[PDB]
Every structure is written in C-alpha cells, then in structure tokens.
Design a binder for this molecule. Structure first.
Ligand SMILES: O=Cc1ccccc1
Ligand SMILES: O=Cc1ccccc1
Ligand SMILES: [Cl-]
Ligand SMILES: [Cl-]
Lengths: 259, 259
C-alpha cells in the first residue's frame, strides 16, 4: 500500500476543532494520521477571545503542535478560512515541517503586502454580514476588532448546503472571535524564505457564499499556487456539507506529495 | 394539528448542549420548541469547572431558563444522566412550570434520602473507570471531586453504539466535570411538595453500559414514575446512537401530556 501521511487540520475563526468531526475518521479509515488543532479562545478553550490579543497568541496551539513533531517529520497542513493566515504564520516558522499547505476555502496571504491585505480586501467587498455582531475591545496596544456570527448569517452564507443537524450543532458551539485585522496590519510581511518556500495548493467549494469564487482568483492571482482543486456543491463549511469529496481532494493531494 | 410542546433539554456531566444536535431538529420539524440548556462550565460555557463550586451554581443556567419563561407556560423537562439531578433541583424551585419530568438514562433521586443517595449507590458498584482521570480541587465549599473521561472509557461505556463521527465529535468537546457528590450529600433532601409533586417518566436505553437495568429498577422502586419507556439498542448516549427512536419516545410522552 501507498505511504500514508499526517494531516494537521486548522479550523476557522469563531469555530473550533469540532468542525472536522466527519473528515477525521474518513482520513483515519484510509490509514492517515490526523491532528485537529484547537486554536486559542476557540471551541472548548475556557479563555475568551478578548484575552488573546494577537494572532501569534491565537496561533500558539498550532505552533506547539508542529514543534512537538519528531525530528524530520513533515505534515500536510490544511487551513480553513482564517486558518489560511494561521498556516502561513506557521510556515514562516517551520517551513521544513510542512510537505504542503492546503488552503481550504481560505485566506491566502502574499509576501508583498502587509499580512492583513487579503482580509482588508474581503471586508471592503463583502456585503452579507446580516445579523453578525461586530464589536471592539481596547487593549494596551490598541483596538482589537471582534465578531460574533449571527445565526441567519450562518445559515445563509456558511452552512446553506449542510444537513440541518450540522447547522444546529454550529449554533450550539460557535463563539465570538476575531480576524486580528489590526494586529496583522502591524506585523512584518510574510517571508519568501519561510512561507513562500513551502509548496501550496488551493481547494475551493463551488458554492462558497462568504469566499466567492472571484475573490479566490484574485487571491491566487496575487500569489500563485501549484494546483487548484474544486469541490462541486460545497458550501463554505465543506467539511460538513461534502466531507467525502473533501476527503477525495485531500487524498489526491497526498498522492501528489508521495512522502 | 395536535398542540405542540416546549422541550427543555439538559445534558449530562462533562458534556454540553451540543449532545442534542440530532434530536433538536427532529423535535422542531414536528412543530415543537426546544431549548438546549448549557450548564455552567459545560460545552462552550466560559468558566472552568474549578470556578463552579456547588451544584446550585452548576444548575443556574437551567434555573434561569425556567425563571424567564412567560406566565403559565409549562415545559417537558428532559434530564440526561447527571441531568436527572439538575432537573430535580429545578422541579423543587419551579414545579408549576414543568408538565412532566423526563429522566433519560438518568439519576432519579427521591425525597427520603440525601440528594446524593442514588449517585453514591451507583459509585459503589460502578465497574471500571478505565482511562478516566480523577482530580481534586479545594474550595471554600470543601473539596470538589473532578473527573475527565478518558477516550477508551468513552468508547467502551458511553458511545459503543454511536457512529464513529459522534465519538470523534465527543472527543473534541468533552470537558473536565464533576458529579458534586460532596455538595449533594449535605444539601437538604428534595421536597415532596416541590419535586415530588411533579409528573415523571423514565426513558431507558437497553444497552446503557453506565446505568444498567437493575440499577434503574432499584431507583424507580425507591421512587415511582408514571411510565417507563425503553429504547431498544440505545447506548448511554442515546441522543447520538438512536435519535429517531428517542424522538419517538418523546413524541409518545408529548401525546400522553397533551393539553
Ligand atoms: O469562515 C469563517 C468565518 C468566521 C466568522 C465569520 C465569517 C466567516
Ligand atoms: O453520563 C455522563 C457521564 C459523564 C462522565 C462519566 C460517566 C458518565
Ligand atoms: Cl474564518
Ligand atoms: Cl452524567
């Protein structure tokens, strides 16, 4: 049989490691290892997002996961939505630990503009926040912008193709979060020698109603990838609406980086 | 159309509102209203269990839920496992807001012994805790016995008939909890005028490896219920392994307490 891989899965803002509950057993049934990280102030972490003030603090559990890998192990690192930013931060630290970066319906930052660039572009473009609640919290180093999705927003823009149970589950577990836009604006550019040296691919859902198909080409035009995979019928929450097709895409990717 | 009901669902220790993610849409599709309470330090509740030092504090979000209901509304109150204790505490405060208590694979306390009596009785003969981690936390209320389920124990004794996806979900969401057995053993006995006045039924799973049949019969013999319903093939986590059959049970209870 084929050599199997270790997939490290990184969830999106306002969510947690739970989002991967359908995909993880699919990958593990095929022989692969899976670590679903839980970011700071996310999921069941009993720390509020207000206490996490920086994207580096947010991302620490991911950093710790990579640091703990044995010597010479490499992983397929999958970042979902805001998780794109977390995986890029990690790739700037431990590029040699990452076989390939999988940007799943994700923000794909570049190594030219300030790290908030793609997030600022999406906020300018996006008009469907609906009943999302936006708020601020003042820290000793400035304003931190926060968000809590509304349930109408969730249903229309993230989960519209998911089973109703998955939506009910998300209603019971989503949390106030942040895209750390101010912090990321002040941070040093991602580097060519770290993040830009790592192999990367894009996996997009054909019915993503938060990260539109054109915005994805714009990002990939600003910063190219080796390959784009498309999941037919996926909503944004594609590991919930089309977990078997996502498994297919990640199995194709693993075959492409035969490790 | 038969008139519908408002179900209030109360989860077990070390879990949270999320466990009802399958049952809740089934009930709502049939026309009912459902409120899935998140107890203190449970699920995404921002407190650790160390900050929740008494069972009254633990139960506060259920008490608040009942307190907030409009005048003369009555609910079907469903307590799962340690949630039998919470719903009894609630019934002793707002008996007139409860149409019927539903003890689902639950501790059924009485009005003769201390409120810890049925827990103490199970704990003495419980069988293996496996890889469950026990710890203590000293407080101004005395010493709290904490536990955190281990994953082998969950698989073997709670989730054995559940889809692998639900088991993985639970691994990503379960938390350190407590059964508050010290606090319960010093609380005043549940009252005959409050708790004892409220209609009750018991719903049991046939394959619950935590709360076995003979123990349930002993509890009911100490404290009678109006009717018993059995879910054939259910594990302890019956909302996850047989949610349709749990729906059918609750639906039958709702027809029995019509009007
Ligand atoms: O995809 C993640 C996300 C989170 C909060 C709001 C919008 C999108
Ligand atoms: O039913 C809930 C429960 C939780 C921890 C251990 C045993 C049972
Ligand atoms: Cl996100
Ligand atoms: Cl319990």
């Amino acid at each position: 049989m084929e050599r199997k891989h270790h997939f490290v899965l990184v969830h999106n803002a306002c969510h947690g490691a739970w989002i991967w509950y359908k995909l993880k057993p699919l990958l593990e049934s095929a022989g692969h290892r899976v670590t679903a990280v839980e970011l700071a102030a996310s999921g069941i972490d009993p720390r509020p997002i207000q206490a996490v003030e920086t994207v580096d603090e947010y991302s620490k559990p991911l950093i710790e996961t990579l640091k703990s890998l044995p010597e010479n192990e490499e992983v397929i690192l999958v970042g979902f939505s805001f998780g794109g930013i977390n995986i890029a931060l990690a790739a700037d630290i431990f590029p040699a630990k990452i076989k390939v970066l999988v940007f799943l319906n994700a923000f794909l930052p570049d190594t030219t503009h300030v790290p908030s660039h793609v997030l600022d572009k999406l906020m300018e473009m996006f008009g469907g926040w609906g009943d999302t609640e936006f708020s601020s919290h003042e820290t000793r180093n400035g304003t931190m912008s926060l968000l809590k999705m509304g349930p109408k927003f969730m249903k229309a823009r993230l989960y519209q193709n998911c089973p109703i149970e998955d939506y009910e589950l998300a209603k019971m577990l989503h949390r106030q979060g942040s895209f750390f836009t101010e912090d990321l604006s002040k941070k040093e550019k991602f580097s060519e020698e770290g993040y830009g040296s790592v192999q990367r691919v894009y996996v997009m859902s054909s019915e993503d109603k938060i990260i539109p198909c054109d915005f994805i080409r714009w990002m990939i035009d600003n910063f190219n990838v080796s390959k784009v995979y498309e999941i037919d019928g996926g909503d944004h929450m594609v590991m919930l609406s089309k977990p078997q097709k996502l498994f297919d895409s990640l199995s194709a990717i693993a075959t492409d980086y035969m490790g």
